[PDB]
Structure formats: structure tokens, C-alpha cells
């Protein structure tokens, strides 16, 4: 790619298509409207992400920023477009599985979308302390997201049968653990401190996205907690 | 009903083709080639997004006719064909060495054909259905004629590889595009000689051969 990162973009692409395939194929033996609902939402997730990843491997959704630093940073802004559509969808999925109110769910995507958007400005500002600034409020907003996820969606599902509560716990644990890594991957890649470059950052976002989208969806879709 | 299976299979196969082309795309290093890889990869992706919808049941509304019948129309196919058939046209075209005005003209006729194809599907007045189906079927003849006539002479001075690859690609287009007006005819939207099931199976076939069979020949061609 630009700095060897093209392999991750490609594996990421195919990893998403493969998970999407499995979900589709597993969609065939579905017989319940509530079940089909999680299926559409869940197939949608890596669909979109695969699109994003594919456009980046072609060389679309890739721009350059000149920082006041005098450093020039290579930004795959398509990630953010992807995340803007997909991360609310992940919130929808688990919120619906949790029995959370529509208001509860909206509350969360609201903060989520704020998160992705402040991440986008932190990625694009030429003023370098403003990159750290907007990264920080972006991480403050993520911490609140993750607080409200376990508190609010966890209280909502606390009266479900074991299957639903534990499928929920597993999902919320995939989110707690993988999402929390995103800002650290950002901080250490070219976008933040530039410890590792583009190569290391892409790979991490590639591993994290796959766990976050395919691993997530596989666990949810392989659960009867999404029937009714 | 039960056509949902071919819609799922259609997505899978389509995604499969996209998978083959992507893994095949890693090797590309000429900008010209890349350009063929993205147009081509984008074709089954749009179609995958298309079958996906009709699988979910999204995009399959019902129209009741003047003569009383109420035909289930998967309108999403028309949304697919609207972007996809001109991408296919752009593919052979660029491969043919044809001009922007050569290629533009054709998608002008391709757009006309698809759209009157849509109104023929959606008209409740059955004389109009057949009228619009006919005028669209005849657009295609112009389309297909100009395609071998004008793209054919564009590629005639090229190398044997692209020539032979082009002929192959106009052959696929010739053979499979010409079935589409008869799939529409013998199916629920036309004379209902087949149900949703066997009409879908058929359109699933044609779409795989016309998109993936096509892409495979092109992307795996020595020419590109
Ligand atoms: C699905 C499996 C593959 C399907 C492909 C089979 C179709 C036929 C393939 C090759 C036949 C090519 C014949 C003409 C090439 C020789 C140049 C003759 O030059 C002539 C100019 O091109 C004028 O157009
Ligand atoms: C906290 C934080 C971020 C977090 C992003 C997240 C959590 C992305 C999740 C993506 C997924 C789950 C895709 C599927 C940004 C934007 C990196 C910028 C730095 C602040
Ligand atoms: C990949 C999708 C392809 C190649 C779709 C092709 C569609 C056509 C050639 C449609 C043709 C039609 C007519 C010629 C007239 C009646 C309406 C249509 C849709 C059947």
C-alpha cells in the first residue's frame, strides 16, 4: 500500500466478506421475524465495513494532512465513514438483544456518533495539540458510552433468561475489550504519537475491526436469545 | 414462493466472485489494470447488495393489474441493472479502446432500456406493459448492434489478446443479455409460464454468468 499497509486492507476486506458469507448462509435456516431482524442488521455491519476496506485497498478514502508539526500524515478517512454507520449498528444489535428502550439505544448511538466524529477531527486537524485535545474528548465520550452500555443495557437485560443475559455479557465483553483498544491504537500510530507508522496502525484496526464485527456477529447470530 | 433460496445463493455466488477478483487483484501493478479491477469488482458488489435486499424481503412490493392479477415484483433487480449494466458496458468499452462518447451513447440506450423495462413491470394497464417491454426489448437490439458494430471496430486494430478477449466478452453479453427479455416474458411479470421460484432461479443464473463469468474472463485475461 502506502507503507506496506495494503495487505491488512486486503485481508481485512476478505475477512469481512467471509464473515458476511457465513452470516448469509446461516441466514437460510431462519424462521422468526425478530431473528431475521438481527440477521439483516448483522449482515449489514461487515457488508459496509467490507465496502470501506475495499475502497481503501483500491486507494480511495485516503488523504494527506500537513501538520503544523511539518509532518505529513496519511489518513484513511474511510474508516470513519464506515465506523459512523457500523458502530451505531452494533449498538442497535446489542440494545435490541438487551431489551433496551429505543430511547436508550438512541442515547448511545448519539454519544457514539459524537465519538466517531471527534475522532475524525482529531485525525484531520493540522494543529497538533488539537489532535490530542479531540482525541481526549473522543475518549471521554467512549468511556461514557461504555459506562452507559453496561449500566443501562445491562440493567435492561437483567430480567432475561440465562441464554440472553450471557449472550449479552459475551457481546458486551467483546465491545468493552476491543473498543477500548481503538484509541490506544490511534495514539500510537501515525495519527497520534507516531510510534508505529501506518503499517502497524492498519493491522491493529484490521484485527480489532474483525473481532469487533465478525467475532461479535458470529456470537450474536449463534444464539437463540435473538428469537421470539 | 420459496425463491428466497436463489436470492441467498445469488448473494453468496456473487460475493464469491467478488472474493476471487479481490484476491486476484493483489497482483495488479499497472494503473490500467487496477481500473479494470475496480469496475469489475464493483459489479458483483452492487449485485450482492441487490440480492441481499430481495433476500431480506426489502424491495419486492406488489402491483395489482387492470385485468385483476396481482404480480409480485422484485423491483430491486432494476436498481441493480441501472448501475451495473453500464459498468459492464464501460468494462468491454475500455477494453475495446472505445471513446467516452462511444461508451456514453451506449449507456444512454442501456438506461433507456432498463427504465422502460421498469415501467413495463409496474404498469397496471397490460397493453402498456407489453408495449414498454417491446420498446425496451428493441432498445437492447440497438444496444447490442452498436456494441458489436462500434466497439468491435474500436478493437479491430488492437492486439490479438484483447481482440479475442473482447469477442469472448461480447459473446457472453450477446448470449445472456438476450435471455433477460424472455425471462421477463415467460415469468410472473409477463405470461407467468413460471412462478417466482423458477423465474428467480433463471435470473440468478443469468446474473452470475453475465457478471462473474464475465469478470472472470476479463480479469483473468492476459490482456489485463
Ligand atoms: C465462459 C467460458 C469462456 C467463454 C468464452 C467463449 C467465447 C469465444 C472465445 C474466443 C473466440 C474469439 C474469436 C475471435 C478472436 C480472434 C480475433 C478476430 O478479430 C475480430 C475482431 O475482434 C472484431 O470484433
Ligand atoms: C476512542 C477514540 C476512537 C475510537 C473509535 C472506535 C471505538 C471505533 C470502533 C470501531 C468499530 C467497533 C468498528 C466496527 C477514535 C475514532 C479512534 C479516535 C480516538 C478516540
Ligand atoms: C448483470 C445484469 C444484467 C446483465 C441485466 C440485463 C438486463 C437486461 C438485458 C434487461 C432487459 C429487458 C428488456 C430487453 C426488455 C424488458 C425489460 C427487461 C428488464 C427484461
UniProtKB/Swiss-Prot annotation, chain A:
The record marks 82 as: Primary proton acceptor. GO terms for molecular function: monoatomic ion channel activity; photoreceptor activity. One of its GO terms (cellular component) is plasma membrane. The chain crosses the membrane at residues 5-25, 40-60, 80-100, 105-125, 133-153, 174-194, 201-221. PROSITE patterns: BACTERIAL_OPSIN_1, BACTERIAL_OPSIN_RET. Changing residue 115 to A: Large spectral blue shift, but no effect on pumping activity. It is a multi-pass membrane protein. The modification N6-(retinylidene)lysine is found at residue 213. The covalent binding of retinal to the apoprotein, bacterioopsin, generates bacteriorhodopsin. Keywords: Cell membrane, Chromophore, Hydrogen ion transport, Ion transport, Membrane, Photoreceptor protein, Pyrrolidone carboxylic acid, Receptor, Retinal protein, Sensory transduction, Transmembrane, Transmembrane helix, Transport. One of its GO terms (biological process) is phototransduction. It is found in: Cell membrane. InterPro entries: Arc/bac/fun_rhodopsins (IPR001425), Rhodopsin_retinal_BS (IPR018229). Different protein aggregation states can be observed, leading to variations in the absorbance maxima. Light-driven proton pump. The chromophore contains 78% all-trans- and 22% 13-cis-retinal in the dark and 90% all-trans- and 10% 13-cis-retinal upon illumination with >500 nm light. Belongs to the archaeal/bacterial/fungal opsin family. This is Bacteriorhodopsin-I. It comes from Haloquadratum walsbyi (strain DSM 16790 / HBSQ001).
Amino acid at each position: 500500500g502506502v507503507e506496506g499497509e495494503g495487505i491488512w486492507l486486503a485481508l481485512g476486506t476478505i475477512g469481512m466478506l467471509l464473515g458476511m458469507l457465513y452470516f448469509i448462509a446461516d441466514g437460510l435456516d431462519v424462521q422468526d421475524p425478530r431473528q431475521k431482524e438481527f440477521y439483516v442488521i448483522t449482515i449489514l455491519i461487515p457488508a459496509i465495513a467490507a465496502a470501506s476496506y475495499l475502497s481503501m485497498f483500491f486507494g480511495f478514502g485516503l488523504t494527506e494532512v500537513s501538520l503544523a508539526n511539518g509532518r505529513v500524515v496519511d489518513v484513511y478517512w474511510a474508516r470513519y465513514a464506515d465506523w459512523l454507520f457500523t458502530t451505531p449498528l452494533l449498538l442497535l444489535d446489542i440494545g435490541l438483544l438487551a431489551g433496551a428502550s429505543q430511547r436508550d439505544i438512541g442515547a448511545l448511538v448519539g454519544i457514539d456518533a459524537f465519538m466517531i466524529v471527534t475522532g475524525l477531527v482529531a485525525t484531520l486537524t493540522k494543529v497538533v495539540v488539537a489532535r490530542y485535545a479531540f482525541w481526549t474528548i473522543s475518549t471521554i465520550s467512549m468511556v461514557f458510552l461504555l459506562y452507559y452500555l453496561v449500566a443501562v443495557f445491562g440493567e435492561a437485560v437483567s430480567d432475561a433468561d440465562e441464554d440472553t443475559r450471557s449472550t449479552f455479557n459475551a457481546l458486551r465483553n467483546i465491545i468493552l475489550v476491543t473498543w477500548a483498544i481503538y484509541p490506544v491504537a490511534w495514539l500510537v500510530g501515525t495519527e497520534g504519537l507516531a510510534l508505529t507508522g501506518l503499517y502497524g496502525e492498519t493491522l491493529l484496526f484490521m484485527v480489532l475491526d474483525l473481532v469487533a464485527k465478525v467475532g461479535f456477529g458470529f456470537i450474536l447470530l449463534r444464539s437463540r436469545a435473538i428469537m421470539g
